[PDB]
Design brief:
The structure is a homodimer of 223-residue chains.
Chain A (H helix, E strand, L loop, with lengths): L6 E11 L2 E12 L4 E10 L20 E2 L6 H4 L5 E9 L4 E11 L2 E11 L12 E4 L2 E8 L2 E12 L4 E12 L12 E13 L4 E11 L8
Parallel strand pairs in A: 1-7, 4-13
Antiparallel strand pairs in A: 1-2, 2-3, 3-13, 5-6, 5-11, 6-7, 8-10, 9-10, 9-12, 10-11, 12-13
């Protein structure tokens, strides 16, 4: 098929957080049906970043989600043309991070193009002070809206000294495939874990891994 | 034992939404270790409510969580003294509903007291127009913070017409038992499902059922 059991991916990112312009590239391979992936990321302009790389983690891959219970896969289905996503991440201590993304397929390779804008990160806050330690696992709830798909989740960023800092994520995903074609699923949930595997030279180079699984609610119901 | 395989509960609630005062009482039973319960509510003042009863659903019992995979139970352990909770719920279309609660134990029966404040529900909104149809299943994330517990989730309220209204839940769970007495757990999640079983006389009487199950993330972790 178009989406094989193993996929390479290539990424290019550009953006400005608190006015510091920057640019990244990455290369990754994953298993789309397993829901596993790995990215090796290079900060190729504006390094070293004056802020925690972790606020960029969730912007480096929806094709790599294990869809199970015959849950229609909005993302896999929209190939070959691809899909886009855009998101607002609202941190509880001021910072807002806006991301827009295009996803495509050239030469059997997945091609991501990402723009980022981060504003209002307090200068003494744990993001600008580089005091974060990766993300906790999370659940995103997905529901049909306006022909596209909407996503919502709360994320917990781990802190130095223990304790977490929370942010809220509103995501929107739109397919580039003709509408009539693909089945949009009902309401569903994606459990994910995003781990930093390796970093070198103050986060100039980062390795990330993600595992992700789609599920209905496994619980019994009186309705 | 203080929390037995069966437990009865009783509740009293005061509050104001969009200026309109009201009072509820309820009573029910459940199986605390099996994570199940059923509560029968009577609106006793300000009936029948000008807003949808759905926005009060989650204010009517953290003691009835089936803590699986040997996760320490902050809620059951706080006994006999009991625990409080406070919560802000923020709807994506205006309204904010904010709540205080005391869970204490009096003669083997669980006694809840709840205060309620809602503002900015727009008149044309599905809440004041009463065009909601219950809640979708939900995942809450819980993380320890400031000598207590904190919870976060996003919820979907089903709407007449299809489609959903989203809201964000920020919670704080403080226990009244002295501090090092308790084994406070790490970061974890609750898969909750809350369902209307029965309504009567335009939501003047409401039967409500909940199934909640605590879990760790069951995804592999490369760390």
């Amino acid at each position: 098929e178009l989406i094989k059991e193993n996929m390479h991916m290539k990424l290019y990112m550009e953006g400005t957080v608190n006015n510091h312009h920057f640019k990244c590239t990455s290369e990754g391979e994953g298993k789309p049906y397993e829901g596993t992936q790995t990215m090796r990321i290079k900060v190729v302009e504006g390094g070293p970043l004056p802020f925690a790389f972790d606020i960029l983690a969730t912007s480096f891959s929806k094709t790599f989600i294990n869809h199970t219970q015959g849950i229609p896969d909005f993302f896999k289905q929209s190939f070959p043309e691809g899909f886009t996503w855009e998101r607002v991440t609202t941190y509880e201590d001021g910072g807002v991070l806006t991301a827009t993304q295009d996803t495509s397929l050239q030469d059997g390779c997945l091609i991501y193009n990402v723009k980022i804008r981060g504003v209002n990160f307090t200068s003494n806050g744990p993001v600008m002070q580089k005091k974060t330690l990766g993300w906790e696992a999370s659940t995103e709830m997905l529901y049909p809206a306006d022909g596209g798909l909407e996503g919502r989740s709360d994320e917990a960023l781990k802190l130095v000294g223990g304790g977490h800092l929370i942010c809220n994520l509103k995501s929107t995903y739109r397919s580039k495939k003709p509408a009539k074609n693909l089945k949009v699923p009902g309401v569903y949930y994606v459990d994910r874990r995003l781990e930093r595997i390796k970093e070198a030279d103050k986060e100039t180079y980062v390795e990330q891994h993600e595992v992700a699984v789609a599920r209905y609610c496994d619980l019994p119901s009186k309705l």
